[PDB]
Amino acid sequence: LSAASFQETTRVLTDAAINAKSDSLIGLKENVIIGKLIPAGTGLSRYRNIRVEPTEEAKAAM
Amino acid sequence: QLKLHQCGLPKAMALELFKPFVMKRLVDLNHAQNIKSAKRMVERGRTVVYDVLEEVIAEHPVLLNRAPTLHRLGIQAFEPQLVEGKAIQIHPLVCTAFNADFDGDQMAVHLPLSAEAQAEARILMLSSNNILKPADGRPVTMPTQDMVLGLFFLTTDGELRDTKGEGRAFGSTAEAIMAFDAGELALQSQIDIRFPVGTVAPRGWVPPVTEEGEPEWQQGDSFRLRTSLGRALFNELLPEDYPFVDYSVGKKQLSEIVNDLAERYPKVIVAATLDNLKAAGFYWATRSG
Amino acid sequence: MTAAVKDEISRLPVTRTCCRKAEVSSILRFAGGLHLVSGRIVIEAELDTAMAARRLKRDILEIFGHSSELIVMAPGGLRRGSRFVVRVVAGGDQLARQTGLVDGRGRPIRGLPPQVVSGATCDAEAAWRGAFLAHGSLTEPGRSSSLEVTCPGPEAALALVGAARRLSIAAKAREVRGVDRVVVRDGDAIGALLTRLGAHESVLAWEERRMRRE
Amino acid sequence: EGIINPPIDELLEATDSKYSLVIYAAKRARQINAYYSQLGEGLLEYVGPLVDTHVHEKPLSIALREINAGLLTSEAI
Amino acid sequence: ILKLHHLVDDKLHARSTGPYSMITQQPLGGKAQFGGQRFGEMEVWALEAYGAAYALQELLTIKSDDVTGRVKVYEAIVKGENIPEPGIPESFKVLIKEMQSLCLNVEVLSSDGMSIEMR
Amino acid sequence: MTELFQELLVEDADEELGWQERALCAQTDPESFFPEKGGSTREAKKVCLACEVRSECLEYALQNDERFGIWGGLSERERRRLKKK
Amino acid sequence: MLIAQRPSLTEEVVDEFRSRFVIEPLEPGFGYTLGNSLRRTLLSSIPGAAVTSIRIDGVLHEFTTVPGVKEDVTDLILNIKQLVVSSEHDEPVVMYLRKQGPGLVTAADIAPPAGVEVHNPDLVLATLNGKGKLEMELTVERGRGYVSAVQNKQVGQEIGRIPVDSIYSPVLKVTYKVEATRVEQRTDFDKLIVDVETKQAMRPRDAMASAGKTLVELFGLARELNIDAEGIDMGP
């Protein structure tokens, strides 16, 4: 996908069709193309898997 | 007049971008009965619509951009405020980042919507957090023209200048300013000024005044320094803890000082100091001659 | 007699925005008025309850976005009844136009605002609650409470009767000596109405009092 | 006052980096907005705000204020 | 001093919603219409360098191509609630159809190897 | 008292859809204007008596010829006899 | 005509002797019309009293050093300058400083005559060591504003009389700025902020009142040309 979107689309596509290559969507360009979160910055799974709750003291106060 | 984290939008553009928010808000305050009447009122441009717009627009960052975007400092988030006219107002300091001139350039404005987009535009991309350049680490948000000139005229030696005074001793900077108002003192003449306890002595400052049985502290001791009124006024712009500068400030020295400030101080203090330097530079560049 | 009832009603928490708007409009219409002085319109609302004035001021500030003064000097002059008066001078015209008292760039609306009418049952009962807080009484002189609340002009009274009808609660408008009110006489309707308004302890006390005496 | 406050350094003292702070503040802001939207219903879900607010204040500002004050916690699931 | 024919009256334009194109459903371009400003490659690179993923995702999906997401975003804004999650842009589907018309057997898989069928 | 100097001089709407907006009954229980069962037709008649667009309401009702409710301060058979006269 | 929006003045107090006044909402312009005039009249149009010259015993006009005193002559003069005094006699009046022995010589040891007062006796003047003696004469008189050291009036009058700069004005520092204030109606209306810092004797409010009185008199001077002339009326 990235190679095709760079340049020489016809040659890249006809080379990938014969080999039956599979794209795993690990880069930035592919994720941008298909429209999901890029795997960098705030799009990583380290940061997005959390739980935000008030402290017991704060909830008790209000 | 803007701050380093502010921009000015024309009210037509602001009302067009923020149409749904304004409609919701003025249906919420009972200014309109439903969405249809609210949309009609917004489209026809009534009076209350702008009053509501000026409060829905608060604390909602907008991303400003100029093409070509050669590096990531070409997109930056600013807090918008309404202005009268049809042209966007931009802080003079950020121009070098955008490579923006005022000979007829144009810029584009985008509006984040979701909470994540606002958090990113407010924490990552804010304008007063991007002093340094990613290429080499030297500041780009720095006083460049008409401010370097003012700060150079303020802090420079009177080689061929008409230096009046040249031997007077003053008890404070206020007295020096009072003498300057009358035609008795020059901004570049050398005089002895006494400073209060708070000030920090210049780096170096090899002699703590020779004594016998009475020490001195690096801070909290009043000392007399022989300098010009211009340097005394320039040192009122820098933070309270910064050592006295006491030397002519071109553009290399200003870059060194700004880099030191960015390295050693928090971001709010650095932004405030940059605003102070900008204001003083313009003020003393007008009277530079 | 009614001080505890009005205290309980004032202390009742409220969440929905439309009901708060209806309550504010009702109280302003009944126990409020407008004055054109110094070329500007000022809204003055007189209440004789401790918490009700604070509640009205908070509602105005929250939903309508305005500031009030909350003076305690008695317009009556006795200063014993604690005749609280809440005032709105800044943006008074906007508040009057956006709360239903005046609409269409014309005369003040005699009845309740059209927004309050033809609304959900919650807004109808909120309007009745505001009307009771503003003016009203619970006499119980003889056999029935005579839960009478006075209104300015036949329009407000008959609008209150209509709102009460939507609650499946009987009511009757009446006029005497040039002043008109809405009253409900039978005990069952009184109890159901007071229960709907939100008061609980007063409702019980009235229930046991009526059952024991009758 | 405004976008400048609260200072970014004080916030970062309560988290690991900017990237985690963005998600943390955004999630709290979504919780506050969801609580406000369904306030008309009588519901027990979502909580806050835990600080004194204005008439109409953006939920993100309130979330950042609570984060700075230290009234929240973050776990990893 | 001369007065040039570059008046600001004819330079200012803004948009929140307007006409859309036919084949690909992105906002129309120009100023005679309402028109949308372009977000080219360089701006995408700048946002990627900043590390802003959610802002980029919303710019690329629920502002240009996500046909069913535009109306939902507008409704959410007007009713005052949370913005919904983005979908999948129409341009990707058009691209897949164009490649399939060339006798190329494209197919998007799940965590296991089963096609999603793209509706 | 609180007359606002007969609508005062502060107005920004400067727009009116029609004579519907000046209807007084809109500030009043709609149900009372359609007496069911036997009902009564005098209180709402009094309400209509003070309406400022009574003539317009009567004219529109007659032109469209509604045979229900009370319009322009008149009930069904008053309208019928006026139509027949 | 009519002003149509009456400006008002409000005060804020920072320290015991620092204030910040805000005047708003001023018409377009009118922020610089009465800003610089306010600053000038505050700084140099208010009477006061101050020291004019000294005569330290045993020291000529040479400022090499003061025997028996740790501080040099420049420090002594600067310390004397910070002294705040009040007086009533038009002619200059002389008072004597007679402190002696090792220790600390402060302003509380002066012996002012009748009609002259010192408003900060706790001020430090110098330090004495080695059983030295400090004999001084201080001449004080009245004036306005800041006047530099009056040079030698008569060369042969005496030997040791050192003249000094005189700061008569109670107000020490003044600054001002203007901003835009109005939001509801058309903007660009001016708001003026004036920051004032005086000395221990006078309060900023009195200085502002005196400045207002002086300017009112000065401009009534011009108004007297034709009293029946239409201006900008204000109402209340």
Next chain:
Amino acid sequence: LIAQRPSLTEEVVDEFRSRFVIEPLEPGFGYTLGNSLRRTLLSSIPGAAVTSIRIDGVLHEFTTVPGVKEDVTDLILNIKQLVVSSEHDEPVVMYLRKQGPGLVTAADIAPPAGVEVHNPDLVLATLNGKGKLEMELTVERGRGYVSAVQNKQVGQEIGRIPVDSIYSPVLKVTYKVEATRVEQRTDFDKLIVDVETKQAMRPRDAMASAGKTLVELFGLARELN
């Protein structure tokens, strides 16, 4: 210590130009007073000016009338220079009627009782042998500059043409601070303010109005107690 107080005296250069000498002021104080007076004079002196016109056979500004040498847009610029003075609070109307060849000089305007036109030698238009000018002018009161979109009323007819209004009787103001060293044993100043008005009022009245405007602000300053 100096007891002498300031004083103001007048000198007349010509009919509409005066020089006011104020002395003896404190040192460094003349420039501020001079500039304050200059700003007030150039800003807030009330007057009167034409705020609208309508011609018999004209619908808008971008057209020409038969028999005249100039467009309507080039006649609006000529009547914008009329120096009129009015005593009526409400708007007043004047009529201009001319027939036959010649010049429509400003003196041909026939004003009602109460208003006056002070430059009767201004040239508005030139008419040939088949042209007649019948025009109606409106005069109001105010101060400063009004941009002809404030002069647009709600019920404007198609034939009414609003016009820019310039209410300013003052023409040129300057000042000179002679450091005369007035002999008082010390340093002092001598301010000299030169005022020229545009033949609508006399400089004494302009100075009096400026002083009356300026005394009020410092009056609300002095009431701080």
Next chain:
Amino acid sequence: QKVVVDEGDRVIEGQVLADGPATEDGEMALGKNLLVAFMPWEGHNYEDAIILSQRLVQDDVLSSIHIEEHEVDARDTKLGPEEITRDIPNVSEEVLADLDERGIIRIGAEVVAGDILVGKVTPKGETELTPEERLLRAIFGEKAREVRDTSLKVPHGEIGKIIGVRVFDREEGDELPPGVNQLVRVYVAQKRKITDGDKLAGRHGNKGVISKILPIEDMPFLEDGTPVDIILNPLGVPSRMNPGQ
């Protein structure tokens, strides 16, 4: 075009009788002579910006008249021909107040964004309506006219007077294209004064956008009290190597 000659003057061959768009007495005149001072002023002329005076707005020193033309045509369709008429289906008469008897706006009438210049109606034919709209129609008893409105409206952000209207009718011998039955053109003119954001320049390649317009009383003034009309930045002269200015 203005006139130069007088009613009695004698003209020789080639002499000038009337000027042009931007000529003054027969010679080119593209701008105005303004009193300029070179100095940096409070940062309002920072980096090529320009500070102007208010005297250039009072006296229309830099004002210009701009004109625009709008076109609309009525043609044939499947369901009969379109019509240019004043009877717009559902709009208040207040909107249809300045329109002429032919449905075309009247000369001399000012317009603002949203107003209709030509009233046009196109037939649409029978269509299915959603249940809610059907119930609304039943409540209000209105009837679909079978024709929708396609009038010509001024674009967004436009203003001005109406200078002229020109109408061609295919049945009046006019040579309209095939399929067009009627055509109409409307001319809208407006006078623009100089405002910030506008771009000025000189003859030596020194351009800049106006970023400030100060009052007359706070411009620098010479010894006799004459304010300066424009303030330029000196820093742009030496680095750009154009000492000609």
Next chain:
Amino acid sequence: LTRRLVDVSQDVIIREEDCGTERGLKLRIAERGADGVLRKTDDVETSVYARMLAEDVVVDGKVIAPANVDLGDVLIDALVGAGVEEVKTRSVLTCESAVGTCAFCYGRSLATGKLVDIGEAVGIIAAQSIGEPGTQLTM
């Protein structure tokens, strides 16, 4: 040129805190002068600043600079004073991280003056920084 540079090096992002590697580049500082006194090399602000030390430096049986430090100007001045010329720093060219690179080998982030974060996108920044000044180089 910038398009090509961005494409070749887009998938280079930080994905670790430390790979534990001990390998590094030998970078020279303090070129010997003709006077016999060590003087800091001219091109050090863009060669050794903002870069960690792979192995600790030991002189006179001490620790002149501990391992894994930012290596600012103070440390360089101290090293030059102590009489040191070559230092074994850490660079991406010698990173053993199994996934991408790691923050320690990359070093400090020049845009914020702090250690690069675990989600940073360094390839795009490098491409943009290299390509931006290409409009000033005489063709």
